[PDB]
Write a protein that binds this ligand. Sequence first.
Ligand code: ZN
Length: 183
Amino acid sequence: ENEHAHFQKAKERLEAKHRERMSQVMREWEEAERQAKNLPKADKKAVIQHFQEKVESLEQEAANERQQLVETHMARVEAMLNDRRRLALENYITALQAVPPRPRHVFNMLKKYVRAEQKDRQHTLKHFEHVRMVDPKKAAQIRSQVMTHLRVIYERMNQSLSLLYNVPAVAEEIQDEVDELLQ
Ligand SMILES: [Zn+2]
């Protein structure tokens, strides 16, 4: 959660920076108007255009900064989650092979593993849903890529969960608590 904090922080600074640049422009627009009070229409009809283009330019720059921020964030989070999933999966598989097997320990490890996968899915889905509400057409461009990722996560988790059946006794003892997890 230290990287979700680092992202929500960076997102706000970016907003404050943009909102700040937007203010000095609107301000400059004022001084430019006052200082053109005596210029001709054409030259006045041009100061408006100049500042609309400057505003438009600022918006594009902020949008760019947002996208670069999200991309980097998605890359970072992905590498961390995969690393988290691998470890948790390793611990879970190891728990299953303990002699004798400890139901509680198997459950705790399996839980950390399911949460990691649930986390990855939710995070991917949340970011894809964000883009779809803001830009439906852009979302349509990354849809297959996103759905493919979701299908991989789901299959991996279900494949990992079915391992529990190689230790039926253990599965019996913790089945209900596992259901609570998957729901
Ligand atoms: Zn995120």
